[PDB]
C-alpha cells in the first residue's frame, strides 16, 4: 500500500545509549546489508520527512523517449545512375547507447513501446530548382513478410503490414505497440545460443552466435519518400524515439562501465579504463 | 576485437571444470583460426561492468576469518517458464578473491575450493531421443 | 512463422512397424494421403503480409 509518491518514514528522536544491542556491528559475508538508520548510531531529533521517491519509480525512470536510430532516404532526379534511396532498419534498442544502458540495469522487462518519428529534409545539390512537400511511408515489416527491394515494388502496398503516412511539416509521427515478445518478458541478456551443435553434424551446420536468439527479432522498418522522382535531389532523415511506457523490470545488473562494442557484452582494447587517478589519502 | 558474440558453444560451456577470469585482456589476433573463447576480465566481472557492483546479485563472501562456506539457494530464473537447458544457461557462478590469499609469511600458499551443487524442483518435458552434442 | 533455430518445432516421421502385406493378385504398391490441421487451442498473432503472393511491376 505504499505508493511511489508517498512520503518516506520520518526520522525520530533518539537519545544516548549504552547496552548490549548491536546496530553498528554485523557481517556482510552473510550477503545482507545492515538496514540502519541514523538513530542507531547517532543522537537525532524528531523530523517530519517530506521527500518521496516519486521520481525514481521504474515508470518514471523510463518515462522518456530516446533516439534509437537515424534512417536515411532520398528523392533524386530521374536521370540518376544510382537508384533512389530507401532505408531498411532492424528494430533494436542497441544501435544507440544511452537507452540501452538504462534498459541494462535489469535482466528482464515488460513494456509497451511508444514510437515517435521526427523527420528532417534538405536539398543537397547547389541549385535553384524546386521540390514539393514530401510524404513518407514508414511500413513495419515483421519477420517473415516481404522486405522491399525497390522503392517501387509491390510491398509498399501494405495490406497487413502496419504503415505510417507522414506528411512533412506536421506533427511528428507516433504510434503504440504492445508487449510483443515471444517470451514472457523481453530479455536483455541471453546466456546461450540458438542452435545446438551435435556430434554427428558438421561444425558448420551446428554453429550459432553467442547470446543471439529470436527473443529479439522484431523485423524491420522500411521507409521511402512517396513522392515520384524530382528534378533536384532532396535528402531526408527520420529520427526514431522509443519510450517504454507501462514498464516492469526484473533482476538488477550493474551498469555498463566500459563503452559498448557490438550488440553483445564484448569490449575492445584500450577502452577498459573507466576510473581516473585518485590518491588514497586525499579528499 | 574483430568479431563480436564470437565464442563457440564448446568454449562457452566447459561444464563441470568451469572457467577462469583474467587480469589482462588479450585479444585474439589469429584471424586464420580464431580461438573463439571468452576473455573475462576480473575487475569488469567479465561483462564490462565493475566487479564492485557485483553485490547487486545475490551473494556471500567466504572471508576466512569468519566463514568456511557460502550457501545460496537459487530459483529457476528466465524470461519463460521452461527452456532448453541444453541451449541455455540460466545462472552463472562467479567466485573471485576480493582480498588476497596469504598465510603466515610463506610465498606460495594454497587452499582448495570445492563446489557441490544440487538441483531443486527438477522437471523436464518433451521427452525424445538422446542429444549428443559436440563438446570439443 | 520463419524458419528459425530458437523457435524450432521438432521433427515428424513415419516408419514401417511391420510391413505392408497383401495376398496374390493384389497391387503390391500403394499410396498414402496425409492431412494436417490445428487443434481447438491453436492461435496466431502479429498480422503481416504474405510472401506467397506478389505483383511484378
Amino acid at each position: 500500500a505504499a505508493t511511489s509518491r508517498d512520503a518516506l518514514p520520518n526520522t525520530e528522536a533518539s537519545g544516548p545509549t549504552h547496552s548490549k544491542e548491536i546496530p553498528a556491528l554485523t557481517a556482510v559475508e552473510t550477503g545482507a546489508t545492515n538496514p540502519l538508520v541514523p538513530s542507531d548510531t547517532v543522537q537525532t531529533r524528531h523530523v517530519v520527512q517530506h521527500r518521496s521517491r516519486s521520481e525514481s519509480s521504474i515508470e518514471s525512470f523510463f518515462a522518456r523517449g530516446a533516439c534509437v536510430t537515424i534512417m536515411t532516404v532520398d528523392n533524386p532526379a530521374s536521370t540518376t545512375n544510382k537508384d533512389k534511396l530507401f532505408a531498411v532498419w532492424k528494430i533494436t534498442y542497441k544501435d544507440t547507447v544511452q537507452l540501452r544502458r538504462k534498459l541494462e540495469f535489469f535482466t528482464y522487462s515488460r513494456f509497451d513501446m511508444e514510437l515517435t518519428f521526427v523527420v528532417t529534409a534538405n536539398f543537397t545539390e547547389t541549385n535553384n530548382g524546386h521540390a514539393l512537400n514530401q510524404v513518407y511511408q514508414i511500413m513495419y515489416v515483421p519477420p517473415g513478410a516481404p522486405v522491399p527491394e525497390k522503392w517501387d515494388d509491390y510491398t509498399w502496398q501494405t495490406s497487413s503490414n502496419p504503415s505510417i503516412f507522414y506528411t512533412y511539416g506536421t506533427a511528428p509521427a507516433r504510434i503504440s505497440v504492445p508487449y510483443v515478445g515471444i517470451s514472457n518478458a523481453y530479455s536483455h541478456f541471453y546466456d546461450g545460443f540458438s542452435k545446438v551443435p551435435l556430434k554427428d553434424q558438421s561444425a558448420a551446420l551446428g554453429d550459432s552466435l553467442y547470446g543471439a536468439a529470436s527473443l529479439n527479432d522484431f523485423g524491420i522498418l522500411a521507409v521511402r519518400v512517396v513522392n515520384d522522382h524530382n528534378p533536384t535531389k532532396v535528402t531526408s532523415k527520420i529520427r526514431v524515439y522509443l519510450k517504454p511506457k507501462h514498464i516492469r523490470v526484473w533482476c538488477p545488473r550493474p551498469p555498463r562501465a566500459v563503452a559498448y562494442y557490438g550488440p553483445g557484452v564484448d569490449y575492445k582494447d584500450g577502452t577498459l579504463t573507466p576510473l581516473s587517478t585518485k590518491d588514497l589519502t586525499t579528499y | 576485437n574483430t568479431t563480436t558474440m564470437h565464442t563457440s558453444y564448446q568454449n562457452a560451456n566447459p561444464g563441470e571444470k568451469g572457467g577462469t577470469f583474467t587480469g589482462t585482456f588479450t585479444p585474439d589476433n589469429n584471424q586464420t583460426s580464431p580461438a573463439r573463447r571468452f576473455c573475462p576480465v576480473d575487475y569488469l566481472l567479465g561483462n564490462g561492468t565493475l566487479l564492485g557492483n557485483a553485490f547487486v546479485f545475490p551473494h556471500q563472501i567466504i572471508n576466512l576469518r569468519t566463514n568456511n562456506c557460502a550457501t545460496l539457494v537459487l530459483p529457476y530464473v528466465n524470461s519463460l517458464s521452461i527452456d532448453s537447458m541444453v541451449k541455455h544457461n540460466n545462472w552463472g557462478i562467479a567466485i573471485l578473491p576480493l582480498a588476497p590469499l596469504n598465510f603466515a609469511s610463506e610465498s606460495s600458499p594454497e587452499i582448495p575450493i570445492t563446489l557441490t551443487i544440487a538441483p531443486m524442483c527438477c522437471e523436464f518435458n518433451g521427452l525424445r531421443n538422446i542429444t549428443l552434442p559436440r563438446l570439443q | 512463422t520463419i524458419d528459425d533455430s530458437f523457435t524450432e518445432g521438432g521433427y515428424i516421421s513415419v516408419f514401417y512397424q511391420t510391413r505392408i502385406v497383401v495376398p496374390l493378385s493384389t497391387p503390391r504398391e500403394m499410396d498414402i494421403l496425409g492431412f494436417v490441421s490445428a487443434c481447438n487451442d491453436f492461435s496466431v498473432r502479429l498480422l503481416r503480409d504474405t510472401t506467397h503472393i506478389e505483383q511484378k511491376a
Partner: nanobody
Amino acid sequence: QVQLQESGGGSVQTGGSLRLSCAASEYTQSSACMGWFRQAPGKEREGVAGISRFFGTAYYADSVKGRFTISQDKAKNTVYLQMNSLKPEDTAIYYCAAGQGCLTTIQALGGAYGYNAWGQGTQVTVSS
C-alpha cells in the same frame, strides 16, 4: 526458406574467369552478406565471400581478395560471384549461404554463424 538454387560448374584452366550464381528471389529476412563456402575434399568447409543485403559490407577471405568479388542483382535476385585468375588451389565445391536477419552479417560481419538456408553445391575444378 528462400529458394537457393545454384549452378556453374565449369572446369576451367588455371587463370580463367568463372561466374557463380545463386537464386534468392523469395524475400524472407533476405540473405544479408549472403555467403559462399567451398569444401576442399582435402580440407573441409570454409567461408569465402559476402556482400551485405543492402549495404556495401563485403567481406573477403584472405586467400581470395581482389581476384574474387561478390555482387548481386537487387531486383533480378540472384547472387553473382566473379572468380578470376583461378589457382589450382581453389578447386572445391562451392555453396551459397543465406544469413537472414541482416544483423547476422553485421555483428559477425562474415557469414558462417548466422546461416540457416544451405545451398546445393557446384563442383569447380581449376587444373592443368
